Amino acid sequence: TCPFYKKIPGTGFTVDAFQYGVVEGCTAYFLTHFHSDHYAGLSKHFTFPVYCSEITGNLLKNKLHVQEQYIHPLPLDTECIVNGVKVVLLDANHCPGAVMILFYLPNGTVILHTGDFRADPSMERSLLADQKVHMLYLDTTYCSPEYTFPSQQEVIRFAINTAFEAVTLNPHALVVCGTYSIGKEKVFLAIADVLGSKVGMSQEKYKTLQCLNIPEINSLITTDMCSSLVHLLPMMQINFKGLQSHLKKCGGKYNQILAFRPTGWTHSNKFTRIADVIPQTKGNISIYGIPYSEHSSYLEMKRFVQWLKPQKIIPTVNVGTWKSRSTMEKYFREWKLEAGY
Ligand SMILES: O=c1[nH]c2cnc3ccc(Cl)cc3c2[nH]c1=O
Ligand code: NI
């Protein structure tokens, strides 16, 4: 059954709640982004209105085959009226098409649902500016001070320089990047751009990227693996066995594999800066784990919440254990006491 933190009180709206059958009283289902945990349940048989970004709408229609009559894409940063309620979609700085949702309840209550997001000071100059928010449904994925990682800029700079140096030293090296889902596309796009190559990938992954409204994708992606020296593979294949098997299939065109595993936070980030990251190596294969996060760090999350000054916070991640809930409520009170709201 649909949990409480996916319900918007005072409306007939749910958020990322497609795996609970027909939710009681839901006139419109909002989808924050196209990640499996959040769209779980949608298919060509869904017969209720889905509200989402245009990019998420492209993915629902092409990847899940949802009928167009049930897809309601909304522009970003635009006050829209949905079933008599004013709503705004804001960029969540997560994966392509990911949004936060502002709900203007009829009784005057204002609710911000972040979906999944990586907080950034640029959000302090969105439509949230000088907007009273009474309730915040917060992506609390990394809501603990030990969760530190670099900016996406620094990680991409490390990936670009690492890939460019390796391929310049060995023109016969292949660069491989692992992928879970949508998101973190900048990793393989920036590597291919510095190497003068297109990104080769499966037809299914190619189809997914064609839905993302990225300007000039036909410039950087392709399904012709032989024409590419930057290949996309499923994240599970980014291991020594999986990469050895892939290299045998390249027809003797390459004698070395440089592989990147885009991860979230890992325990290595407690001791190792991005500049000092080193790979796992076995023979002619090296694997880099790079902390490219599309979720807020603790400090980014704290800064955003202390700026927004919500009257109530409802976590949407790490809600399953009393220890996590107690830990998160303690930090919420700390932020409130320090900031003074
Ligand atoms: O949509 C999303 N789903 C999920 C699901 N499981 C996860 C497990 C671990 C970490 Cl670090 C991130 C996760 C995640 N992040 C997303 O953005
Ligand atoms: Ni997500």
Would you kindly state where each structural domain of the chain is located, as residue ranges? 4-145+295-339, 152-290
Least Cα distance to 231 among 264, 263, 253 occurs for: 253
Calpha distance 18→89 (Å, rounded): 19
CB atoms within 10 A of CB 182: 24
Task: Tell me the CA–centroid distance for residue 230 and ligand 2, in Å.
Answer: 25
CB 69 within 8 A of CB 51: no
Calpha distance 156→197 (Å, rounded): 17
CB 89 within 8 A of CB 114: no
Count Cβ atoms within 10 A of the Cβ of residue 290 and give its class: 0-12 exposed, 13-18 middle, 19 or more buried: buried
Calpha distance 163→258 (Å, rounded): 7
Calpha distance 258→164 (Å, rounded): 11
CB 92 within 8 A of CB 33: yes
37 pocket-lining for ligand 1 (C-beta < 6 Å): yes
Nearest residue by C-alpha to atom 3 in ligand 1: 37
Task: Tell me the CA–centroid distance for residue 94 and ligand 1, in Å.
Answer: 11
Calpha distance 216→202 (Å, rounded): 19
Calpha distance 279→336 (Å, rounded): 41
CATH number of 4-145+295-339: 3.60.15.10
Nearest residue by C-alpha to atom 2 in ligand 1: 35
Token couple for 193: 């751009």
- Which experimental technique did the depositors report for determining this structure? X-ray
Nearest atom, ligand 1, residue 293 CA: 11
CB atoms within 10 A of CB 299: 13
CB 229 within 8 A of CB 175: yes
List alpha helices for 211-339, DSSP H.
240-248, 298-308, 322-339
Q: Give the residue, out of 37, 93, 316, with the most ligand 1 atoms within 8 A of its beta carbon, to mutate for a pocket test.
A: 37
264 pocket-lining for ligand 1 (C-beta < 6 Å): yes
CB 112 within 8 A of CB 101: yes
Task: Tell me the CA–centroid distance for residue 17 and ligand 2, in Å.
Answer: 14
**Cβ contacts of 328 within 8 Å, gap of 6 or more:** 140, 143, 315, 318
Coil/strand/helix, residue 16: coil
Backbone angles phi, psi at 310, to 5 degrees: -70, 150
CA angle 16, 20, 22 (to 5 degrees): 100
Nearest residue by C-alpha to atom 5 in ligand 1: 37
Count Cβ atoms within 10 A of the Cβ of residue 308 and give its class: 0-12 exposed, 13-18 middle, 19 or more buried: buried
CA angle 223, 190, 279 (to 5 degrees): 95
CB 30 within 8 A of CB 9: no
Token couple for 314: 């409802």
Task: Tell me the CA–centroid distance for residue 253 and ligand 1, in Å.
Answer: 36
Resolution limit in angstroms?
1.8
Domains 4-145+295-339 and 152-290 fall in the same CATH topology: no
CB 277 within 8 A of CB 310: no
Backbone angles phi, psi at 103, to 5 degrees: -115, 120
- Going by the DSSP 8-state scheme, the letter that residue 188 receives in this structure is H
Token couple for 148: 């530190």
38 pocket-lining for ligand 1 (C-beta < 6 Å): yes
169 in the Ramachandran plot: left (φ > 0), alpha (ψ -120 to 50) or beta? Answer: alpha
Task: Tell me the CA–centroid distance for residue 192 and ligand 2, in Å.
Answer: 24
Q: Report CA 279 to chain centroid distance, whole Å.
A: 24
Token couple for 338: 């320090």
CB 292 within 8 A of CB 263: yes
CATH number of 152-290: 3.40.50.12650
* Distance set, CA 184 to CA 93, 94, 284 (Å): 11, 9, 26
Bridge partner list, 285 = 257, 282
Task: Tell me the CA–centroid distance for residue 94 and ligand 2, in Å.
Answer: 7
Coil/strand/helix, residue 2: coil
Nearest residue by C-alpha to atom 6 in ligand 1: 37
Calpha distance 269→210 (Å, rounded): 33
Coil/strand/helix, residue 238: coil
Residue 9 half-sphere exposure toward CB, CA atoms < 13 A: 12
Calpha distance 323→97 (Å, rounded): 33
Calpha distance 316→140 (Å, rounded): 6
35 pocket-lining for ligand 1 (C-beta < 6 Å): yes
Gaps in the chain (C to N over 2.5 angstroms) fall after none
Q: Which residue has the tokens 């969105």?
A: 126
116 pocket-lining for ligand 1 (C-beta < 6 Å): yes
Least Cα distance to 209 among 95, 116, 292, 71 occurs for: 95
Task: Tell me the CA–centroid distance for residue 171 and ligand 2, in Å.
Answer: 36
Coil/strand/helix, residue 274: helix
Nearest atom, ligand 1, residue 294 CA: 17
Q: Report CA 12 to chain centroid distance, whole Å.
A: 26
Count Cβ atoms within 10 A of the Cβ of residue 273 and give its class: 0-12 exposed, 13-18 middle, 19 or more buried: exposed
